[PDB]
Amino acid sequence: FSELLDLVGGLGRFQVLQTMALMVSIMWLCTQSMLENFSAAVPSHRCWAPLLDNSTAVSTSLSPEALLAISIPPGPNQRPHQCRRFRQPQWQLLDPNATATSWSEADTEPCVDGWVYDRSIFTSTIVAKWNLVCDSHALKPMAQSIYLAGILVGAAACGPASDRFGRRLVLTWSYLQMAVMGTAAAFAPAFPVYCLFRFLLAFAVAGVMMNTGTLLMEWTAARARPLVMTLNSLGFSFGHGLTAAVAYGVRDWTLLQLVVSVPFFLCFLYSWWLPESARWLIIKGKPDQALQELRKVARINGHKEAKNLTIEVLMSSVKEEVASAKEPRSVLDLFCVPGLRFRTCISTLCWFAFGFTFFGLALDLQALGSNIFLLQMFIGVVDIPAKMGALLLLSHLGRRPTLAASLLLAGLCILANTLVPHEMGALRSALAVLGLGGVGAAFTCITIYSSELFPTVLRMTAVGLGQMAARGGAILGPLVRLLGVHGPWLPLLVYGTVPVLSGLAALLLPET
Ligand SMILES: O=c1[nH]c(=O)c2[nH]c(=O)[nH]c2[nH]1
């Protein structure tokens, strides 16, 4: 096919504009995923109580700090209890001499009158709106898990739709669906509907993710394909900083979710403008339109060959592939052929390690550091140079030497969080971010690597399987964090255990 791109211009204006346009959409799409750190942030909270919150209460010289000890028992974390209150005011507890036995456990009651939340950092969050705390606390990681399962099912549905209707035609409606479903999620009346809308949003997120990359590859000459895919990957790195900026600017979740969703109505329009994938139209029985798309791109690049491209030349120049790639085949065919079976096994373990380790740690930054906005931004700041170095190593050594080394180093950095002492907070945050950056370098490496390992028709299906495995690990992520009832030691050890072994296994994969 590349002989035709050589007539159309393999790296001209059109590829520049296409890369820019898709990079922007990928940035906003990344904000859509990372938003959970800010839309669903858990403000500190306590039970409503008369002496603290009754506006009709008789005034006294007692400070709020004293009334709080009079009204809320001490929690096991040595802070005011977040799920209990005193049945009757403990005036006796005002003195410092009071024993722990002064108030009986039977004097405590749950938040009968509801919770009160800290408004200082965020004006509103879903946790504050639907009381996803105490007995309901599990619902937040359930929301994240449902979002990731939505991505998984969307990856399952994208491939067939992409091949049946075209790359750009699926991408366009994925943009529209993201816009509409995010706008609706911003206004959901109750938690079940919010989860429903987030799920239907992730369903389209998956299609955008896959189609943008596939359509970048299918229009770019091979000599610069890795560079373009690296830029498409850096879209997410910049999306991290964009998320930090918007979350700093918009402290209300109902407004933040709307703001990060509206841009996709604009992305819709430019998705309409773009051309459908020429190779797809050529192989899928529509050269008559592939010629029109080709000469559209030629006009944009300014080539004279618009006078040369003709249907007979088009049919002649792709004879080999048109004569052989006539068969659609099921997903399980990736596992039926002996060679593709092993390629898929190793690539799937690599994708699983990426998705597991990254999405386990990237969505709970409130535990990793004292400033969630800055810590969110630092993920992009560290991911940029990691992915550029990944590109350089992938070019000057190869795909195989880069993948294994990146995963091993990221695994080591992840594990180090369990060996540095708890009190050295800054170093722990630094190492966590470094591990995330190494996993990002492995993400870029494998994205390029596994797109080469599979044939023309099934490339999209192979990448979809990669997405599904990575999001299986991602779904296990929040549940691995629900395992945190035994303390943070277990989740971090779990996250660190996988990537090192996945890297050691990666070395068996053939170079491409
Ligand atoms: O390197 C990545 N960083 C991300 O923040 C992100 N988000 C996502 O869905 N895929 C990726 N990949």
Residue numbers in the entry: 3 to 514
What does the paper behind this entry write?
Among the several renal transporters involved in urate flux, urate transporter 1 (URAT1) is the primary one responsible for urate reabsorption. URAT1 is also an established therapeutic target for the treatment of hyperuricemia and gout.
In the presence of urate, we captured URAT1 in multiple conformations that represent major states in the transport cycle: outward-facing (cavity open to the extracellular side), occluded (cavity inaccessible to either side), and inward-facing. In all three conformations, urate binds to a similar location in the central cavity and this binding mode is notably different from previous predictions by molecular docking on homology models of URAT1.34,35 In our structures, the urate binding site is surrounded by several bulky aromatic residues, with five phenylalanines (Phe241, Phe360, Phe364, Phe365, and Phe449) forming a hydrophobic cage that encapsulates urate with hydrophobic and π–π stacking interactions.
